[PDB]
Structures are given as structure tokens and as C-alpha cells.
Amino acid sequence: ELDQLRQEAEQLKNQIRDARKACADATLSQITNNIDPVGRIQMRTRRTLRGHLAKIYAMHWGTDSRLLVSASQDGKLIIWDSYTTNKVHAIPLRSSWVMTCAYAPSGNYVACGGLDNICSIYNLKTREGNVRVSRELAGHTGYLSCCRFLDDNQIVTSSGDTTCALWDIETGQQTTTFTGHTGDVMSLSLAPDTRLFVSGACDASAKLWDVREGMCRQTFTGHESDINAICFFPNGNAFATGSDDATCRLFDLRADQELMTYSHDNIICGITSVSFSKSGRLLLAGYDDFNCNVWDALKADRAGVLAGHDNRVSCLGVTDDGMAVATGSWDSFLKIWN
Amino acid sequence: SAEERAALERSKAIEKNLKEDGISAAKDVKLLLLGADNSGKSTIVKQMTGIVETHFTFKNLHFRLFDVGGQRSERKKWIHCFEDVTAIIFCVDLSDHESLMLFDSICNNKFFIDTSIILFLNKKDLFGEKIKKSPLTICFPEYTGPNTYEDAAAYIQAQFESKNRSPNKEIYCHMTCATDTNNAQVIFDAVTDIIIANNLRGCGLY
């Protein structure tokens, strides 16, 4: 009986391949060839948020494009003030192992988590004047890799037990759980619509979920190695996933396959963080090769090298207004670039 | 600068607090602990669902010991967190090749190429009792020698040493009986050795 089911699954996969190939009339490159290239794009180190004493793992820009929160192995999640480099808060982490950060759209809550299997929600506007833990969400059997807020009330977390869940900070219970992944789910990115999201797992595949229905709506494949980053296009109809094979692809939700592949012969280190720009023309992707490349999202060719870090960059964040980009390396230095 | 002076004062205060915390925490020495299940990690933890952190102080050194064996996930995706560890403590149960494979995997990793691995052998008495009746060829078929504790232990030592490939790291093997209290002294001496080796490295002389 299991052999028949396996054969049916293989036939379904072949049907998926045939349907995906039948829709590929042309390529993105030969359509974008008629566009004027952006040319060389140069940006300088406007700011340098010194103060960290350990490796920086995340940096999420606030909804007002001024507040940036970063956590390190020192056990502190300092919420910086990007314009004047002032440090606003210093969150004391219960355990020094932190692997993710998040910032509320209203700025009230800051989320953190790591190997402790627990996603913590902090409160910034407490009446007592100090930061207090609002809720310690538990229920994951693996390390939390990336957490994002849909709003001030509900958080979605991607953990290392091949499962992404939608929490409820008010009650602290798993309202809805998404399952189906094979490997570690090491990335997550909520769409601008915020009704759906993706989670690029370690099995070289990124699955598109639905927040409300809680079912794997669509799936994508084509990567060679693990996926370490993912982020939606601003239009919400596409996303870019950064693999560990020194290449990052630009999938399309409607097409259901990779459109353009971003590879070049002089790159050997895997991606660590990939994020678009406000208009989506650029793709500021961090690298493990000591550098930080930015590519033209359409012509699929390099437009500049943002080499300014003494260690591997572990995060990348573009402000909602597009005025600056932040890269947090392992050299304990967070830099704001424009 | 209407009220931004107060903001600068708050920033300076919290920066001083972070600096003091960093200076206080820089005196501690971290030692990642690994090993098989029921391989003697617990007994040495006692002698002195997430990650388990154990801290003991000896001779004015704050030793931080992490038992990360409870992480039921891929080791590759989180092993970079312990890249800055001073030394790696390895525990092997001699009462029973999985530990050999784990040691081989952890020794040649890209993030542990310059950190020496301390190898601790537990359950020495149990192994000595078992070897008196069951030859060492049962666990390791390639062995060929007298059936006694003295040479079997040396053979196990040699085979564990043979799994390394980097010449910039050393393996400080010591044998424990799971009941002696001298383990802390051995760990402290090994840590001092590694620390002075790193200091000699920093001066461009070793």
C-alpha cells in the first residue's frame, strides 16, 4: 500500500514539474535587458553603534525607522537611537544565548530568544519605568531562530524542531502551529499584507504558509544547500531566499519557481542575511565572506561592494522609509549605512 | 541641546554599566562540555529542556560549564555560538564507536580548529572489570594485543588521538574513576596551560 502512495506522490511531483515548466515562456533577464542599469552605487559608513562586547546576531529596525534593537552573546539587547547614536535601553537577558530579535510596530514590545527554547516578550512602556518580561513563551523543542510580530498581540516564531508556530502573547499558548518541514526552520519573514509568511528551512526549500488557515499553501525548491535568510519583495508577490551555496534566488509566488539566480564565480561563502530595498530595485545581501554585496534585483549583476566590517555580518536591516541600511557583524560593531 | 543632555547622561550611565558588566564577566572562563548519553557528564557535573549551564569556582577562577547535549537538533546550525570557548571537555564512557564518531566530527569542524579538546575517560573501574572477562576486540575488532587494562587503555587513547588532523591543537587526555575529587585540579591545570599557550600565540612567539 505504501508503494502505491509513493508512486502517487512521485506522479504528483512530476505533474508539479511539468506545470512549472509549461508556464516558463521566457526569463527575467531577457525582459529586464531593456532597462538602464543602475550603475555603480556607493555608500559610506554614516554611523557606528559602538558598545557591544560580543558577537551581534540580529538587528530589527523599528516601525518609525529610528529605533534599532540588537542582541549579543553578552546577554544585553540594547535598543539604540540611530540618528544620534544614543543608547535608550539595555535589556538584561536571562540567558546569554540569544539568536533572534524583533520590534513591535507600535514600539511597545521587544522580542528575543535563542537556544533556551523560550521566546521572551519584553515591555518598554511599563509604568514602573523599567523593562519587565511580559510573557515567557514556551512549547518549542528546538532553538528559536527568528521571531516577528504580526501586531502587538501575536508573534510567529520559527524554531529548530521543523515547526513554525503562531503564538498568543496575551495567553502564552500556541494558537496555531505550522508543520510539514523536514529540516531546521532557520528563517522567517512576514509579508507586508501580514496575512501570510514564508519560512526557509534547512532542507533547501522555502514553504509559503497562511496565517489564518494554517496550511502549506505553496512550496518552492531549487536551492542546493541550507537557507539562512529570506525576505519578501515590497510588492508582496515575490521573495528572495539566501542559501548557503553562495547564491540567492528570487522566487515568485504566482509563477511557483525561481525567476533569477544570483551567482558569480568569485563568491564561495554562504549568505547570512538578505533583504530588499524600499523600491525593490536593489538586494542588500550580507555574506560570510567578510563583505556585504548589493545586487541589482533585475539585471542580476553586482552594483557595489559594502566592505566595511572586520568580521562576518550576521544580520541586515533596511529602514521602512529606505533612508538607511544596518549590518551587524561579529566584530561587536553595528554600522548604519546610507 | 534642550533636554538631550539628560539623554546623553542616561546613555553614559548605561554605557558605564555595560562596561562594568563586561569587566566583571571577562574574568570567567567558559568550557563547552560534550559527550555521549550517560557517558559520565553528569557524575563530573555533580563532582564540582534547553541548554544546561553549570558554574563552579576554584582557585579564584569562575569556570562556566555548558552541557549542550540536550539540543535535539542539527549540531551544525548552532555550533558557531561556542566559537569563543576556551576549551572543549569531552567525556567518553568506557563501560560499553558512537563517541569516536562524535569526537571525529567535532575535532575537524571549521569553528574548532584552534581550540584544544580535553578528553576525559570515565568509568575506568567498570572498564577494567569488563576487560577481565570480555576482550577489547568485541568493541574494537581491529585490536590485537594482550587482554589487560594497561595496554587496552593505551590503545583506546591512541585511537582517540588518531582522529585529529590539526597540528595546532592538543588533546589533554586524563583518566577518571568517577569517584575521585581531583578532576577540578586537572581541569584547572589544563585551562592554565591553554591560556598561557594562547598568550604566547598573541605575542607572536609560539
Epitope: 535608550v88 | 534642550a2 539628560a6 547622561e9 542616561r10 550611565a13
Partner: single-chain antibody, 231 residues
Amino acid sequence: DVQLVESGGGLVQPGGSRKLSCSASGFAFSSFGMHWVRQAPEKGLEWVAYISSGSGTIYYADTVKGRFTISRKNTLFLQMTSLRSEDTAMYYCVRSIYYYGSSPFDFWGQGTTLTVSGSDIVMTQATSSVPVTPGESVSISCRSSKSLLHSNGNTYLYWFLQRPGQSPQLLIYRMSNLASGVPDRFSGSGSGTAFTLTISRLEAEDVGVYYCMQHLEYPLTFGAGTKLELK
């Protein structure tokens, strides 16, 4: 939750010395800069002094420097020397934290009464008493000599309200934002020099006196006090 209690008043002969103690409980008082505000028996609020977190900086008013001393176990102290004839007032202990997006002067102490036997920025209130009926809209405006639009763009105009028999509470800070615990009816406006706090659908519990502050530079100055009486 948060509660500020202070004591140490009473009748004092002229030329004496007294100590006023501000006891803080229910919040992280170590990271807050406690101010000090007095109120004349029949006039508006006046400033005394300010001590920051960790006693990094301390300021005094024009006629207070040298005579008084402010120091802070979760307890704040104010030393008094050579009380004059006009030093009699009701003293308020005011808490305030300063960071980007913070709410300074958010809470005020209970207040203790006490009896005895030219280049600074000044703000004036055009009106003092304006009759108003419930359900209508009331507008209170105060002007400043120096424009408050600083370099960063934030205008430092605060609006304070005290109901009769009650300590003042913050209503609108920075002339645009709304303090927590304040209903949406209150709304601020104005830019540069003119300011106006507009109230829509007035309630019977909003009667009192309105004071507008500036925070551009010490010393802090208050308005004359616009009182909105019923009918």
C-alpha cells in the same frame, strides 16, 4: 502601584532651616530625575530645582540658588536655609525620565503645605478665567517670548492640569503627544510661539486650572494659570 509621599512641612520661624523628604516607592527611582515644584497659596506653580539620575547635574531657580540644596534607599531630600517671607508654598515632588519618546513630568506627589511668620525664557497666558459649559469646546492658549521649535524639530511645550483639591497631572507633552491615562478628548496644536490645547466634548470632571510649561532650558517657567470654571 506608583505612589509618591513627602512630608516635613509646618510652621517655621523666619531665618530657620528645614528638611523636606520625598519618599518614592513602587518604581525604579534610581533611574529617574526627581524635580521640585512649589505652588503659591493663591498663584501659579513655580520651579525650585532638579536633580538627575546619579546626581550628575543639579540646577536651581534664580531666587533659590545657594539657599536650598537637593539630594537623593528610594528617598529624595531638599535642604532649606534662611527661609524668606515668600518661601511659604505647597511643595510638589515630581518624577521624570528623559529619553527619546519618554514622558517627563508624568506623575506628581501629594504636596505638603508650608507656612512662615531677566534673560530667562518667560511664557504668558493671555486669559486667566474662561467660563465654559459641559458638552461645549474650550480653547486655552499661551504664548512664549522665544520660539520653542528647537533644532531637532521637537517643540518643548507641556500642558498641566490640576483639579481643585488635587495635585497636577500631565495632559499634553511636547505640544503634540498625549500622555498615558489621558482621554482622547484633549488635543494639542500650535507651532513656534502660539500654542492651543483644544478640548472636544468637555466632561464635568475636566474643570480646573491649566498650566503650560517650557523645557527648552532651565530654569523652567510656568504660565499664569488659565482656570476653566463651570458655566
